[PDB]
Design an enzyme around this catalytic site. Structure first.
Site, PDB file in Angstrom:
ATOM      1  N   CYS A  80       3.766   1.421   9.385  1.00 43.22           N
ATOM      2  CA  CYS A  80       3.633   0.336   8.436  1.00 43.22           C
ATOM      3  C   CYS A  80       4.966  -0.077   7.880  1.00 43.22           C
ATOM      4  O   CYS A  80       5.804   0.767   7.587  1.00 43.22           O
ATOM      5  CB  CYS A  80       2.623   0.666   7.343  1.00 43.22           C
ATOM      6  SG  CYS A  80       0.939   0.916   7.970  1.00 43.22           S
ATOM      7  N   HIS A  98       0.810  -1.221   0.000  1.00 40.31           N
ATOM      8  CA  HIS A  98       0.000   0.000   0.000  1.00 40.31           C
ATOM      9  C   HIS A  98       0.852   1.284   0.000  1.00 40.31           C
ATOM     10  O   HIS A  98       0.271   2.369  -0.017  1.00 40.31           O
ATOM     11  CB  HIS A  98      -1.086   0.017   1.103  1.00 40.31           C
ATOM     12  CG  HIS A  98      -0.572   0.126   2.508  1.00 40.31           C
ATOM     13  ND1 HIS A  98      -0.471  -0.983   3.324  1.00 40.31           N
ATOM     14  CD2 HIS A  98      -0.172   1.214   3.201  1.00 40.31           C
ATOM     15  CE1 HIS A  98       0.012  -0.539   4.474  1.00 40.31           C
ATOM     16  NE2 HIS A  98       0.210   0.777   4.444  1.00 40.31           N
ATOM     17  N   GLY A 151       2.537   5.816   9.801  1.00 37.24           N
ATOM     18  CA  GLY A 151       3.968   5.791   9.511  1.00 37.24           C
ATOM     19  C   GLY A 151       4.664   4.528  10.011  1.00 37.24           C
ATOM     20  O   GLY A 151       5.783   4.234   9.584  1.00 37.24           O
TER      21      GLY A 151
HETATM   22  O1  KXR Z   1      -4.174   1.515   9.348  1.00 38.05           O
HETATM   23  C1  KXR Z   1      -3.340   1.973   8.569  1.00 38.05           C
HETATM   24  C2  KXR Z   1      -2.204   2.859   9.042  1.00 38.05           C
HETATM   25  C3  KXR Z   1      -1.832   2.694  10.497  1.00 38.05           C
HETATM   26  C4  KXR Z   1      -2.265   3.594  11.459  1.00 38.05           C
HETATM   27  N1  KXR Z   1      -2.191   3.359  12.775  1.00 38.05           N
HETATM   28  C5  KXR Z   1      -1.666   2.180  13.115  1.00 38.05           C
HETATM   29  N2  KXR Z   1      -1.238   1.220  12.288  1.00 38.05           N
HETATM   30  C6  KXR Z   1      -1.334   1.499  10.984  1.00 38.05           C
HETATM   31  N3  KXR Z   1      -3.332   1.739   7.236  1.00 38.05           N
HETATM   32  C7  KXR Z   1      -4.193   0.914   6.475  1.00 38.05           C
HETATM   33  C8  KXR Z   1      -3.663   0.219   5.392  1.00 38.05           C
HETATM   34  C9  KXR Z   1      -4.493  -0.623   4.693  1.00 38.05           C
HETATM   35  F1  KXR Z   1      -3.976  -1.286   3.624  1.00 38.05           F
HETATM   36  C10 KXR Z   1      -5.820  -0.811   4.994  1.00 38.05           C
HETATM   37  C11 KXR Z   1      -6.334  -0.101   6.069  1.00 38.05           C
HETATM   38  O2  KXR Z   1      -7.672  -0.327   6.319  1.00 38.05           O
HETATM   39  C12 KXR Z   1      -8.233   0.115   7.574  1.00 38.05           C
HETATM   40  C13 KXR Z   1      -9.737  -0.174   7.514  1.00 38.05           C
HETATM   41  C14 KXR Z   1      -9.464  -1.124   8.673  1.00 38.05           C
HETATM   42  O3  KXR Z   1     -10.144  -1.857   9.389  1.00 38.05           O
HETATM   43  N4  KXR Z   1      -8.140  -0.882   8.639  1.00 38.05           N
HETATM   44  C15 KXR Z   1      -5.537   0.762   6.810  1.00 38.05           C
END
Ligand code: KXR
Ligand code: KXR
EC number: 3.4.19.12
Lengths: 304, 304
Positions: free
Chosen positions: B145, B41, B143
């Site tokens: 990821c 992503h 950030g």
């Molecule tokens: O969450 C983060 C980015 C992130 C933020 N906080 C903590 N850790 C990661 N990105 C992200 C990437 C992705 F490919 C799908 C997606 O879907 C959401 C809907 C659901 O549930 N998840 C979110």
């Protein structure tokens, strides 16, 4: 989101760990520049530990009696000295992996990462707090002496703790990197009691702010209190009295959540008087005091 | 003595963290040999994330569109491929700090260390368990990821997890290093529910053995039970059913403490039915399930 007892990345400290042997005793040493630091009780035998005369014991030891090993390479000892409860072994080679570092003596209530080591090799890393009674609630076994506690400020490692002993209580005691023990402890095999330990109030409040930032708001109430009234409650529950300095340090968290510090104090008062009624805060059934306001800000903002 | 949620020393993994930028998006990458692995992503924009067609999106990207930075040095991308939900960017330089490594897909209930990273730089290390519902209860922000989960077997790092997303639940989802998600999760910005999560019974028992080894024996009782009777209780309290394989894995801890597994099960049964009555076990007011029997043995024996 999420909140964990997070340690600093330990790579800069792993590159400093060595093994120090003196006679039959093996423990961990910290190699920085051309000096290896380790607990002075490496020169003792089990009988010496009952009432050691370190000055006389060290007099029977020469540079060649201290064996220092970094991984598989033997370091050559060209000098030896005792500074309080640590030995400083001068080696002929400067540690090529010496990071930027400082030796700091932390305050009770402050936190740090421990890199637990055995035979000069690291086994794990965890986060600790220096307790108000100057002990740490670590995880250490025989052979772990010489393991260090530190903090990292971007590229600079601040070494604050060297592990020396375990009290029969199960709690741990040690020194700063100048060999000065935190607390009243002495490096002698004799019954020693860590005084009454209190709960770090400013840290519990910081963690209540981390809970609010993470969605856990059930404990928030329609009440407020005063420093003096909250302090009457803190003394009853073995909590450190809250000062205006603590209130000021909670300022960034108070501004971020929009909840005044004295209102957070009133939630803590009701949590103290009523318990948690089978509920949890940040995955915990008790009030956590090992996260400072700096730790909460850093974890909630992603400081690398 | 003492028992802490201990992570592996992270130095071998810190030497692998890089920053990957594609367009406006920056995340973390894992540089091993001449390949940088990162969540796919990274090629998306916020509008692409609602329903991304990764194959079409990646087709508009060339080797020069992926910016890879290791500390302050720019790596040259000479190849790019998508393997499930990760991108493999071939660089012209092999990582000189590549440790001995394996890519393993861990089982639910197993544990691992997370090195949380932002902009290719590590900020902290903590211990996690892969939950039975295939999520992890981490501490991750925007950030983060590309941050990885691993275990270390003496000198070999087993990479098991790459962080991809946070569910609105606050829990975290990700993939193995082949880009296969643990669980039913997809890398799309759409409502996804992590199923019902259960308590890892074998891990709680392992932790009850760690408590006994550490002096905490108040919960031990004069009762015993059977696998079938204890399992009737486990289903009532959302606990994984205990099998003879779990009993066998608890063998070393049962031999060390001298307490038969079925007797430890009866203590756990009474702890489930009666709670803790305001008491704690290993400094905890709840039953801990994020320590495997291997973790207990390793921590209680000092494996480096
Ligand atoms: O969450 C983060 C980015 C992130 C933020 N906080 C903590 N850790 C990661 N990105 C992200 C990437 C992705 F490919 C799908 C997606 O879907 C959401 C809907 C659901 O549930 N998840 C979110
Ligand atoms: O505890 C360990 C060795 C050790 C074992 N397990 C965990 N961490 C460390 N050594 C040690 C060293 C020392 F100079 C004094 C001393 O006194 C005992 C009496 C009292 O309390 N402490 C013990």
């Amino acid at each position: 989101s999420g909140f964990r007892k997070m340690a600093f990345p330990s790579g800069k400290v792993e590159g400093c760990m060595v093994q120090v042997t003196c006679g039959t005793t093996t423990l961990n040493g910290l190699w920085l520049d051309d000096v290896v630091y380790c607990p002075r009780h490496v020169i003792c035998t089990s009988e010496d530990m009952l009432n050691p005369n370190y000055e006389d014991l060290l007099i029977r030891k020469s540079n060649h009696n201290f064996l220092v090993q970094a991984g598989n390479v033997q370091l050559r000892v060209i000098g030896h000295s005792m500074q309080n409860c640590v030995l400083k072994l001068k080696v002929d080679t400067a540690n090529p992996k010496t990071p930027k570092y400082k030796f700091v003596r932390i305050q009770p209530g402050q936190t740090f990462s421990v890199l637990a080591c055995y035979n000069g090799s690291p086994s794990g890393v965890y986060q600790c707090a220096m307790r108000p009674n100057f002990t740490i609630k670590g995880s250490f076994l025989n052979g772990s002496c010489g393991s260090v506690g530190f903090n990292i400020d971007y590229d600079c490692v601040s070494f604050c703790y060297m592990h020396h002993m375990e009290l029969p209580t199960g709690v741990h005691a040690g020194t700063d990197l100048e060999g000065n023990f935190y607390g009243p402890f002495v490096d002698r095999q004799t019954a020693q009691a860590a005084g009454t330990d209190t709960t770090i109030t400013v840290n519990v409040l910081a963690w209540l702010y981390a809970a609010v930032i993470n969605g856990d708001r059930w404990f928030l109430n329609r009440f407020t209190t005063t420093l003096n009234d909250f302090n009457l409650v803190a003394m009853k529950y073995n909590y450190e009295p809250l000062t205006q300095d603590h209130v000021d340090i909670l300022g960034p968290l108070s501004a971020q959540t929009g909840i005044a510090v004295l209102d957070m104090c009133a939630s803590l008062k009701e949590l103290l008087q009523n318990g948690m009624n089978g509920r949890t805060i940040l995955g915990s059934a008790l009030l956590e005091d090992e996260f400072t306001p700096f730790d909460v800000v850093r974890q909630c903002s992603g400081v690398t």
